[PDB]
Design a binder for these strands. Structure first.
Ligand SMILES: [Mg+2]
Ligand SMILES: [Mg+2]
Ligand SMILES: [Mg+2]
Ligand SMILES: [Mg+2]
Ligand SMILES: [Mg+2]
Ligand SMILES: [Mg+2]
Ligand SMILES: [Mg+2]
Ligand SMILES: [Mg+2]
Ligand SMILES: [Mg+2]
Ligand SMILES: [Mg+2]
Ligand SMILES: [Mg+2]
Ligand SMILES: [Mg+2]
Ligand SMILES: [Mg+2]
Ligand SMILES: [Mg+2]
Ligand SMILES: [Mg+2]
Ligand SMILES: [Mg+2]
Ligand SMILES: [Mg+2]
Ligand SMILES: [Mg+2]
Lengths: 106, 258, 62, 220, 103, 53
RNA sequence: AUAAUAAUAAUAUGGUAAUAGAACAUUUAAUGAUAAUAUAUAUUAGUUAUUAAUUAAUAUAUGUAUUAAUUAAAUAGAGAA
RNA sequence: AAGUAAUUAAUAUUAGUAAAACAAUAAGUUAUAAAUAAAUAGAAUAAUAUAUAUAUAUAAAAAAAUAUAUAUUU
RNA sequence: AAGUAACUUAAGGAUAAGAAAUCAACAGAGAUAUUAUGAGUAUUGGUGAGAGAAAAUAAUAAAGGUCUAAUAAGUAUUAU
């Protein structure tokens, strides 16, 4: 399993700059073991409960919109995304619901 | 209905040219994973590495003499009562002219800092990625990968200059002249260079000895994130680049799924 | 380095997110008092919030 | 230009420490938070000193004792084993037993194990793995769940050195060229525990010679 | 075959040079002056008639024997029957189980 | 790409080579990046002056 | 669904001990063009809602900033002993 | 001319990884199961506490305290 | 506080320790010295102030075991 494959082994769509990944597209990578990266965190002494999504490559905003379209029970203002690390934060505990949606495709 | 309509697969390769040292003539394309040369610029991780390296590199020789290490006798300079002046003890008190320094540090002061291994590996890749994105990373390979363009006879295939030890000519030798014209042709004379090499290349250090102030040669298992970011033009052997990639690859388990 | 306060360690034990303690007053001179009333003097109680801050300092490794 | 001149820490990962005694308008002026006069102003006093009142670490009676002979055991509920199987992470060849060695290697039990792991039954109702298990002990409900799914369980006795050999035998092979033999129980309470069919002890279920030797001496 | 002279550890080599396995060593305590004197056993001086400590202490005896076992050298080492110490399988099998365990 | 650089006399970053996929893109990139500096030396790029106008 | 700036309505803006947030001056280390038509310091007079930095003039030194800016550290700020 | 340093512990923010984390040579640490002074005890036999685990008690329950479960283990 | 400060005495480039009348537990390791986990752990205290190991696993380490005794008695042990 070489880290540098042969020049012939690679094909066009595996080269950065093709297949317009960075536009209107998002990919979420599973953890080392193979579980979805959705975790719950208790903050400020356990009083505040949040849900986080990590390992997001692409456009976080549209992934946020797509999830919002699938879980309309979570209010509009509960979602918040940090741009420094590309993490989507939900003001409640919705690890179960988000995992159900995410696994549908990823 | 489509659950996640805007979801797709990411690319997993970027193209890096392979050339010869004296003249940066391309020889072949060697695909390289996106994690090691094309990664998003996250300055925070670089900031963690740069300060971490900066802390571990300190000497900490500060050593002011405290009131205990200051050489004065422990005798009351003046009687407590009746003298009409302020109360004073021994002549080492910080408030006096010749007294020691309060809260004095003692060498060797400790400034060591520690970082998780995974964070350091990520920072290192982000450094190569920034150099490659800015088109400042040159790879000198061959002799181990398929060649689709013959190597020039005069040029070598590694970061080393031959005939640099036959200095039984004049005050100069061939190695310097080759280096000087290499510097001039590519317009990188006064600019900072970093040469990462597989093994100790005595020829390159000898030729670059005149330019200590701007040219530095480092081995595989010595390069730091500071030196890669500092250098405006990084030259790295393909063998070294592979070694760095393995040493700083995101370990992955089976992760078998349907 | 910081050392656990043994006097506290011998009287307080960690239970969940707080500490557990015995009751004081039922070691001698108990005859003459109703046994049912004295039942409240046997068993364990939980650390009061007033001194919880102290206990963490006394038993840092607990 | 080099990026070294534009690096900046991530927001929220840095504050400014409070300077003391460096200006009135700074907010921490002459007293610098100490207050007005007192022992705490120009001295240090134990944060847990009550002022002479009988302290909270003397009013109450010393309670309990420490069992230096305690044998703490790690925990592994049946829910985890099923979860590993569902996630396709139990690479168990047919006919193989899920002992301590496999649990450590497969990541089922992580971190140091000093004495053993006891199998409990938190997800017994969902457990349908017919593999054969082996651990220091198990709950009665776990035993029922293991056998309900067509499996089996046995309880084995491992000393700290014996357990170490059973966990990474290759270490002993490369060091001494010999895997040390397992140690027979010498405590009454251990012999009694592993001679019970209710606990599925290895002495009773495999009828080791130790019980026979005990029996022959008892009736002699 | 001689080229496995250096393969053996230092202790096993040194023992063989000092006590060649060609000479047969008695299994019982004898006179110190006697050639067939076991270094692992307390021999008795003939003139002073007082027992001598074994030349190889019990740790050194155990070390050399254990190295000998790992490399198949058993009979070449002098006998240790009267050393009141058994190693590995022989100890495990012919073990006098405790009176407390039995009763 | 090697022929384009060898005869043009310039050098293209490896990143652009990976991303650009048609010769039209190569001509558009080279025309919009190297030419403005080549024709007007004052409109050059200085590493010490990245954010320059 | 953001940031900067500007508008309209409303509420608030004394403060010792204390708590919380944000900035400025000096020095050191990493990165870091320019140059006597410049740079540093001092005086005087202006500008910016001003412990600071700037414009001009004057005087002295230097063919010259550890200079702007982002970080990391302080022997980092004195009418109070 | 005056809140400094070393070795530890607990909280808050961010970053990395994540039912695991640090570290890899092993070892160790923490989390993953709550209790009891302690012991060979340890969470839905069929669903939300009316079930279950531990502690007192019992034949077993009730009673008091804490904890556990309603495509995905926190 | 502390077998610390201080005084006195003796020797060498170093000195001290060192090849088990050692640990450990029915399975085993195999001298000494220093550091880390073990461990603030067992243990101990006007059960106050406080004090606090060992086994085992790692790192530096050197060829690291080897006889020089006729195998050791007012010695071990006991009382104090
Ligand atoms: Mg009582
Ligand atoms: Mg009452
Ligand atoms: Mg104030
Ligand atoms: Mg007062
Ligand atoms: Mg005052
Ligand atoms: Mg006060
Ligand atoms: Mg105010
Ligand atoms: Mg720092
Ligand atoms: Mg000062
Ligand atoms: Mg002054
Ligand atoms: Mg003032
Ligand atoms: Mg003492
Ligand atoms: Mg002395
Ligand atoms: Mg000596
Ligand atoms: Mg000696
Ligand atoms: Mg220690
Ligand atoms: Mg003797
Ligand atoms: Mg005595």
């Amino acid at each position: 399993a070489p880290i540098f494959p042969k020049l012939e082994d690679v094909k066009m769509h595996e080269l950065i700059g093709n297949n317009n990944f960075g536009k209107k597209t998002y990919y979420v990578e599973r953890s080392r073991t193979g579980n979805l990266p959705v975790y719950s965190a208790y903050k400020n002494g356990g009083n505040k409960i949040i849900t986080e999504i990590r390992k997001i490559e692409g456009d976080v905003i549209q992934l946020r919109n797509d999830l919002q379209e699938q879980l309309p029970f979570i209010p509009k203002k509960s979602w918040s995304v940090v741009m420094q690390s590309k993490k989507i934060i939900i003001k409640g505990n919705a690890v179960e619901a988000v995992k159900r949606v995410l696994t549908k495709k990823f | 209905l489509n659950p996640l309509p805007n979801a797709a697969i990411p690319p997993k390769y970027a193209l890096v040219t392979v050339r010869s040292f004296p003249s940066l003539e391309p020889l072949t394309f060697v695909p390289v994973p996106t994690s090691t040369v094309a990664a998003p610029l996250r300055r925070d991780i670089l900031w963690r590495a740069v300060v971490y390296e900066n802390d571990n590199r300190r000497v900490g020789a500060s050593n002011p003499p405290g009131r205990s290490e200051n050489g004065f006798s422990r005798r009351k300079l003046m009687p407590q009562k009746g003298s009409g002046r302020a109360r004073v003890g021994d002549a080492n008190s910080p408030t006096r002219h010749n007294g020691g320094r309060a809260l004095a540090r003692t060498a060797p002061n400790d400034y060591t800092t520690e970082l998780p291994s995974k964070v350091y590996s990520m920072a290192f890749n982000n450094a190569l990625s920034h150099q490659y994105k800015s088109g400042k990373l040159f790879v000198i390979g061959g002799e181990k990968v398929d060649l689709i363009s013959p190597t020039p006879e005069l040029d070598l295939n590694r970061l080393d200059l031959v005939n640099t030890n036959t200095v039984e000519g004049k005050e100069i030798f061939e190695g310097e002249v080759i280096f000087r014209k290499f510097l001039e042709e590519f317009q990188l004379k006064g600019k900072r260079l970093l040469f990462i090499t597989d093994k100790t290349r005595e020829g390159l250090i000898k030729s670059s000895d005149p330019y200590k102030q701007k040219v530095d040669v480092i081995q595989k298992e010595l390069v730091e994130v500071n030196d890669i970011l500092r250098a405006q033009a990084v030259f790295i052997e393909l063998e070294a680049l592979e070694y760095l990639a393995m040493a700083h690859q995101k370990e992955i388990l089976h992760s078998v799924s349907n | 380095l910081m050392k656990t306060h043994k006097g506290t360690a011998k009287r307080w034990r960690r239970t969940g997110n707080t500490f557990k303690r015995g009751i004081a007053g039922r070691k001698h001179g108990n005859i003459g008092w109703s046994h049912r009333s004295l039942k409240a003097l046997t068993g364990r109680k939980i650390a009061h919030p007033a001194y919880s801050k102290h206990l963490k300092r006394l038993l840092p490794y607990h | 230009v080099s990026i070294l001149g534009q690096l900046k820490p991530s927001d929220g990962s840095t504050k400014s420490f409070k300077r003391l005694g460096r200006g009135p308008s700074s907010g921490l002026g002459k007293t610098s938070g100490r207050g007005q006069k007192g022992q705490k102003a120009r001295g240090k006093v134990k944060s847990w000193f009550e002022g002479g009142q009988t302290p909270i670490y003397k009013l109450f009676p010393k309670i309990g004792f420490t069992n230096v002979g305690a044998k703490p055991l790690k925990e592994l509920n049946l829910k985890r084993i099923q979860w590993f199987h569902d996630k396709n992470r139990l690479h168990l060849q047919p006919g193989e037993v899920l002992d301590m060695n496999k649990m450590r290697k497969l990541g089922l039990v992580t971190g140091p194990i000093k004495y053993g792991v006891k199998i409990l039954a938190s997800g017994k109702f969902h457990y349908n793995l017919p593999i054969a298990l082996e651990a220091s002990r198990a709950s009665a409900k776990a035993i029922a769940a293991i056998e309900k799914a067509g499996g089996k369980f046995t309880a084995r006795y491992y000393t700290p050195l014996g357990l170490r050999a059973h966990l990474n035998p290759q270490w002993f092979l490369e060091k001494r060229g010999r895997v040390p033999l397992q140690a027979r129980p010498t405590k009454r309470r251990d012999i009694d525990f592993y001679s019970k069919e209710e606990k599925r002890g290895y002495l009773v279920m495999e009828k080791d010679k130790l019980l026979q030797d005990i029996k022959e001496a008892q009736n002699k | 075959y001689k080229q496995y002279f250096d393969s053996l550890p230092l202790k096993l080599k040194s023992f063989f040079q000092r006590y060649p396995p060609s000479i047969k060593y008695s299994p019982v305590s004898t006179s110190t002056k006697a050639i067939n004197a076991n270094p692992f056993l307390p021999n008795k001086h003939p003139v002073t008639q007082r027992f001598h400590d074994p030349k190889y202490s019990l740790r050194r005896m155990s070390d050399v024997y254990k190295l000998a076992l790992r490399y198949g050298v058993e009979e070449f080492l002098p006998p240790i029957e009267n050393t009141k110490k058994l190693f590995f399988e022989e100890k495990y099998n012919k073990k006098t189980l405790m009176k407390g365990v039995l009763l | 790409t090697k022929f384009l650089q060898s005869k043009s006399g310039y050098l293209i970053p490896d990143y652009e080579l990976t991303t650009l996929s048609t010769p039209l893109q190569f001509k558009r990139y080279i025309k919009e990046k190297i030419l403005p500096s080549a024709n007007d030396p004052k409109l050059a790029y200085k590493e010490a002056e990245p954010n320059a106008i």
